[PDB]
Design an enzyme around this catalytic site. Structure first.
Site, mmCIF file in Angstrom:
data_model
loop_
_atom_site.group_PDB
_atom_site.id
_atom_site.type_symbol
_atom_site.label_atom_id
_atom_site.label_comp_id
_atom_site.label_asym_id
_atom_site.label_seq_id
_atom_site.Cartn_x
_atom_site.Cartn_y
_atom_site.Cartn_z
ATOM 1 N N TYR A 192 -6.495 -2.559 12.798
ATOM 2 C CA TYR A 192 -7.435 -1.575 12.220
ATOM 3 C C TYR A 192 -8.894 -2.081 12.376
ATOM 4 O O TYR A 192 -9.726 -1.907 11.455
ATOM 5 C CB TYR A 192 -6.965 -1.230 10.799
ATOM 6 C CG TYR A 192 -6.498 -2.404 9.970
ATOM 7 C CD1 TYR A 192 -7.308 -3.529 9.723
ATOM 8 C CD2 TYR A 192 -5.233 -2.386 9.407
ATOM 9 C CE1 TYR A 192 -6.869 -4.590 8.919
ATOM 10 C CE2 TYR A 192 -4.782 -3.438 8.626
ATOM 11 C CZ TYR A 192 -5.583 -4.542 8.360
ATOM 12 O OH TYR A 192 -5.037 -5.513 7.534
ATOM 13 N N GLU A 248 0.957 -0.222 13.949
ATOM 14 C CA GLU A 248 0.023 0.364 12.983
ATOM 15 C C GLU A 248 -1.391 0.426 13.589
ATOM 16 O O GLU A 248 -2.038 -0.644 13.796
ATOM 17 C CB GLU A 248 0.018 -0.481 11.713
ATOM 18 C CG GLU A 248 -0.846 0.055 10.592
ATOM 19 C CD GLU A 248 -1.279 -0.981 9.568
ATOM 20 O OE1 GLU A 248 -2.049 -1.893 9.854
ATOM 21 O OE2 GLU A 248 -0.845 -0.853 8.259
ATOM 22 N N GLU A 276 3.842 -7.859 7.606
ATOM 23 C CA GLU A 276 2.493 -8.409 7.301
ATOM 24 C C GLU A 276 2.589 -9.547 6.277
ATOM 25 O O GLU A 276 1.811 -9.626 5.342
ATOM 26 C CB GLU A 276 1.582 -7.288 6.786
ATOM 27 C CG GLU A 276 1.198 -6.215 7.771
ATOM 28 C CD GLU A 276 -0.001 -5.363 7.320
ATOM 29 O OE1 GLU A 276 -0.437 -5.416 6.112
ATOM 30 O OE2 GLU A 276 -0.588 -4.721 8.213
ATOM 31 N N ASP A 291 0.861 -1.208 0.000
ATOM 32 C CA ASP A 291 0.000 0.000 0.000
ATOM 33 C C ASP A 291 0.889 1.248 0.000
ATOM 34 O O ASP A 291 0.761 2.098 0.904
ATOM 35 C CB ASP A 291 -0.945 0.009 1.194
ATOM 36 C CG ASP A 291 -1.979 1.122 1.144
ATOM 37 O OD1 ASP A 291 -2.447 1.419 0.017
ATOM 38 O OD2 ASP A 291 -2.324 1.655 2.262
#
Ligand SMILES: O=C(O)[C@H]1[C@@H](O)[C@H](O)[C@H](O)[C@@H](O)[C@@H]1O
Ligand SMILES: O=C(O)[C@H]1[C@@H](O)[C@H](O)[C@H](O)[C@@H](O)[C@@H]1O
Lengths: 599, 599
Positions: B468, B504, B413, B165
């Site tokens: 998230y 994050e 990740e 990303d």
């Protein structure tokens, strides 16, 4: 002239004429000569009533039009209204209206922001359709409230010059209606609510005009009769009264019956039992000091301009309630009466203002060549002063019984440097007190008419200061602004020893403009600058209130000072909050209700 | 391979080749066949070095190019460098570079984010101009770090598919330079700084590679010799040492002298005396628990892409200092070494990460058809694992002596659900520990590889979770998000009893989007959602850190998820603060420095 708010009663019906009307400009000004009211408007389009005409069409040539426009519709008189007194009413036509029912001229009104009406009984037949034509004019001159100058260019094209910082929207801004009374009717009511010091007793004076014998019943919120009386005038005694208090607004109902030998009329008037008074530097409601928080507002929204709208009124009241606002001022014109019905019911405190903004040729806001003497035959003169007196009378005649209205503002930011200023304003101050002795008066004060300069504030009861140190001057300098502000508020306290309300403090703030330098136009500067004002207010004992300029971003005349309009809103025009909304929420919900904050 | 940072010394000069170079695309891929390095590039334009090539030209066709591009300039060898060892160095070429000096191939490198260099003594003449040509390739495949797939369309047009990303910027992102040593030189240095428990003594091991006799002098910040030694290796004793502490960063200088019979070389290495260790669920610096605050960052700015720039580095450090950040992670690639020189000097704590993002075919970020097995011959295979080992070696070889670097992240990740995951990662974990036994290691954990799912986190020392909840799932629902988050952090504490850093947490936030409903994309939701995370972190004893995603809005691949890019910034790409910057400022400056907050 008597102006009770129409309400449905066993003796009174209402039929709203709101909806789509026919609409036409009259660029050649031939509509009176050609008697446009005698037929269908010829080259017309649909328009929403109520609403400003200016922004409905996405058309610059309509938005910027100066002159007459024409509204028209057809309507059926209800069959059952035969034998009834039938009234045609416009809650507001900005700025002038003339009305025809078929070919009969029935009404005319100058003043964009209060109601006018005529008995049309003789000009209609129950069960038949009538044609209503309205000629609406939006031109300002030196005898209109507010004043302006029409500049005609070499080609005869009209452009409105004006001296106030909001767009000169025009049209049928509020509801139009037919309503009935019986041929005996309650034409007028004045109440005065007196309140013992101890708050444990109150008295309610009444005065009624009607063509019949008058009785009154005062009912509490449970509809229990607490007092009865007889005659056109008198006093009701109320033991252990439920006072109208800011933040609650308990209302009684005074039912006025006019009985003739044959017919009768019932008018219910909502009554809030409350006293207002200035003592020294305190503004007292029900004998207790009050501290004003909240806003200068405007009647302004996307697409509809200054048109009234229930969803906007519900949404905006929910935003003022959330942020902890207890009060607002009707800057700079009388607001839709529905706002004062709302304030009465929820206990919101209101400074009720006239449309007399712009009496000032030395600001940078509004918009040809300005006259050199503000108070002269060729500008603000004897006829202007008459027109201003009429605007004050019409406001008080409409709003005299609203318990939410705690003070009259007779103008915003006149230039009071010249000798003419006191000569013009003194008689206006005196006549306002005679019209309603139950409320203090103000005249909102412009920044350059400082404590050492101003010539008229001694004639008034409360000092309403509009101040923007750190914006228009000491630009971006909070440190200097803070010194100048504190110095001037203390000089005002020394000079007049009145309660001081800051009725305007705000800075242009572009939503989404953020800065680490806390500099002008940023969300961060809005926060730091309001915070600096708050710190200064809390150190001055005479400051009894703070009304942020403005509740929301709003339309203005185009110019180099206005980035698509006035950006001093706490909210955007679409009602989204800027960071400063959360600053105000914490200060206003964190203080004790109605009580001056502390350092 | 030995990689000391070039520094000017009595024995060492540097000449930066930064500036304007000639630039050319090679759409037909004929530049190697036509030996473009043998002359002036033919159809060239000026480009800034350092900088990404992509955004310098406001040209979509260049921004979106996949293949080789060509850089070239001419440069004079300083006359006085005759007899000196002359090295040509690129601090970083994204992702592959081949370099020619006139017609001699001198260097090649794969890996977009660490330095490469060659001895060019034999290929230049002091006092004459040479031509430097660079063939730069930006293509990712399953053996590049990070991985990707080039899709060739039916017409032979190349389009880069990738699984991370952030936008696949390419070019000469960092400084290019010639530098000198004497023909005897210090080629390599490893320090290890040991620190007594009581903090009242420290030891400094050294190891040096050089073609000459080696002496060392350790000097304090006043330039006073505190210790001396001899030989290629040994230990310096330091009484009452000034430890390198987070928030201060006291540095010594270890001067390494290589003396031959004829010539000698002096290399000064900045040394921070500090120990790092995990004990239970505590991350210890100098034997004291540390609590990380700050950011995941990116190398990303308008116009220059991932190019290094001093003004940006000065401005961003001033923003991190202001907001109270004590730490950051080099998400998701090694950063310019100037950042680690800054961290060393000001005492900023850094998690140093490799470019191994994208090892994950089950996210919605990046961008043809993905292979079905992530760990297979046709995707992440033996050669990929070799390439990953090489990327870890090159990072550690560059950064092993930076006291600011407290931990190695070997990837971000990866999908760890398949059996292949542990088989691929286990040997990488072991080899990282052998390469640098002085720092804990991590592998940053993707949200769907939860405590009940993940197969590799036991092989690492610190749990770095990217989370998230309330964004990609439980969208806009803080109440559910809070329950799921707390449950999962406690399940991780139970499972591994490691220190947990949230590396994050963030939500897309459009600057200037404001909402009374606190809903997704608004400034208000960013504030409420970070606040909910903070409340949960403070209730979990294992949480030793919080790094907000991300410091600033940054460029991504175009898609339906990205409104002109990634809007999870605390700051806009032009470094303006969102409301959430002030939320973080209060929490991070209000806590005690380096100490877990409290409820
Ligand atoms: O300039 C401004 O934003 C305001 C204006 O909008 C307002 O009508 C005045 O009462 C005062 C200020 O001049
Ligand atoms: O989606 C996002 O905003 C982020 C992304 O930018 C980041 O690289 C990942 O480590 C995580 C999230 O997926």
């Amino acid at each position: 002239s008597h102006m009770l708010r129409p309400v449905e009663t066993p003796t009174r019906e209402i039929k709203k004429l709101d909806g789509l009307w026919a609409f036409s400009l009259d660029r050649e000004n031939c509509g009176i000569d050609q008697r446009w009211w005698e037929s269908a408007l010829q080259e017309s389009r649909a328009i929403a009533v109520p609403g400003s005409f200016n922004d409905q069409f996405a058309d610059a040539d309509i938005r910027n039009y100066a002159g007459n426009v024409w509204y028209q519709r057809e309507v059926f008189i209800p069959k059952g209204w035969a034998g009834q007194r039938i009234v045609l009413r416009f809650d507001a036509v900005t700025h002038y209206g003339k009305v025809w029912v078929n070919n009969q001229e029935v009404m005319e009104h100058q003043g964009g922001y209060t109601p006018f009406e005529a008995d049309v009984t003789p000009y209609v037949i129950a069960g038949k359709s009538v044609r209503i034509t309205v000629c609406v004019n939006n031109e300002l001159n030196w005898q209109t409230i507010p004043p302006g100058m029409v500049i005609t260019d070499e080609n005869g094209k009209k452009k409105q010059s004006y001296f106030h910082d909001f767009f000169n929207y025009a049209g049928i801004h509020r509801s139009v209606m037919l309503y009935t009374t019986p041929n005996t009717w309650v034409d007028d009511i004045t109440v005065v609510t007196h309140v013992a010091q101890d708050c444990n007793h109150a008295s309610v004076d009444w005065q009624v005009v009607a063509n019949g014998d008058v009785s009154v019943e005062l009912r509490d919120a449970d509809q229990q009769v607490v007092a009865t009386g007889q005659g056109t005038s008198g006093t009701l005694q109320v033991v252990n009264p439920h006072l109208w208090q800011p933040g609650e607004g308990y209302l009684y109902e005074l039912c006025v019956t006019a009985k003739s030998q044959t017919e009768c009329d019932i008018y219910p008037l909502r009554v809030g039992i409350r006293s207002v008074a200035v003592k020294g530097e305190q503004f007292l409601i029900n004998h207790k000091p009050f501290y004003f928080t909240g806003f200068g507002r405007h009647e302004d929204a996307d697409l509809r301009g200054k048109g009234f709208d229930n969803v906007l009124m519900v949404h905006d009241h929910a935003l003022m309630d959330w942020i902890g606002a207890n009060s607002y001022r009707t800057s700079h014109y009388p607001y839709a009466e529905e706002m004062l019905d709302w304030a009465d019911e929820h206990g919101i405190v209101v400074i009720d203002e006239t449309a007399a903004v712009g009496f000032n040729l030395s600001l940078g806001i509004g918009f040809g060549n300005k006259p050199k003497e503000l108070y002269s035959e060729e500008a603000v003169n004897g006829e202007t002063q008459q027109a201003h007196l009429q605007a004050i009378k019409e406001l008080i005649a409409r709003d005299k019984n609203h318990p939410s209205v705690v003070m009259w503002s007779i103008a915003n930011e006149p230039d009071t440097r010249p000798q003419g200023a006191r000569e013009y304003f003194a008689p206006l101050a005196e006549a306002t007190r005679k019209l309603d002795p139950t409320r203090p008066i103000t005249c909102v004060n412009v920044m350059f008419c400082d404590a050492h300069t101003d010539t008229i504030s001694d004639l008034f009861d409360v000092l309403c200061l509009n101040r923007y140190y750190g914006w228009y001057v000491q630009s971006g300098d909070l440190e200097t602004a803070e010194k100048v502000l504190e110095k001037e508020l203390l000089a005002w306290q020394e000079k007049l020893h009145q309660p001081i309300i800051i009725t305007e403090y705000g800075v242009d703030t572009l939503a989404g403009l953020h800065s680490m330098y806390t500099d002008m136009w940023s969300e961060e500067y809005q926060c730091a600058w309001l915070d600096m004002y708050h710190r200064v207010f809390d150190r001055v004992s005479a400051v009894v209130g703070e009304q942020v300029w403005n509740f929301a971003d709003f339309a203005t005349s185009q110019g180099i000072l206005r980035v698509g309009g006035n950006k001093k809103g706490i909210f955007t025009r679409d009602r989204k909050p800027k960071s400063a909304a959360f600053l105000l929420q914490k200060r206003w919900t964190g203080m004790n209700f109605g009580e001056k904050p502390q350092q």
